[PDB]
Amino acid sequence: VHLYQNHFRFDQQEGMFQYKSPTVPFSIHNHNPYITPSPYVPYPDEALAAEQERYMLTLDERLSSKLWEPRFERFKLIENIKQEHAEKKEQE
Amino acid sequence: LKMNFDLEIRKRYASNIESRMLPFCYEAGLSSG
């Protein structure tokens, strides 16, 4: 068993288990070596704020409700289906 | 060809009364719901 900040896993585990289980993010002016640079940057009380954010997130289906533990079930299902199909084809 | 009735029943363990109703309907056999 290995312990981390907010998750843990067994030694031979390829996933993770949460403890609750059973720069400038989202900015288009950021830079990394795989995209072009932006020309707008140099070359490479709280109740009111909460109310404004709530007003700004109106009609946003997925984010307004939230205002997250992936399990990869569809990926595993696709892997299983492909393996079964390959096994069936091997016979013929 | 068919409907995976067992994928919808499991959501019972995931307004509130509406959420709990459909798994019960599918489990009994009420395809209409």
Partner: peptide, 24 residues
């Protein structure tokens, strides 16, 4: 009951439905 069902679902997801051994 609900806790047991959730734990069983989580374990089945983690183990890929018994195809994977995570305890070794």
């Amino acid at each position: 009951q609900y806790q047991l069902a959730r734990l069983h679902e989580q374990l089945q997801a983690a183990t890929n439905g018994g195809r994977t051994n995570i305890f070794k």
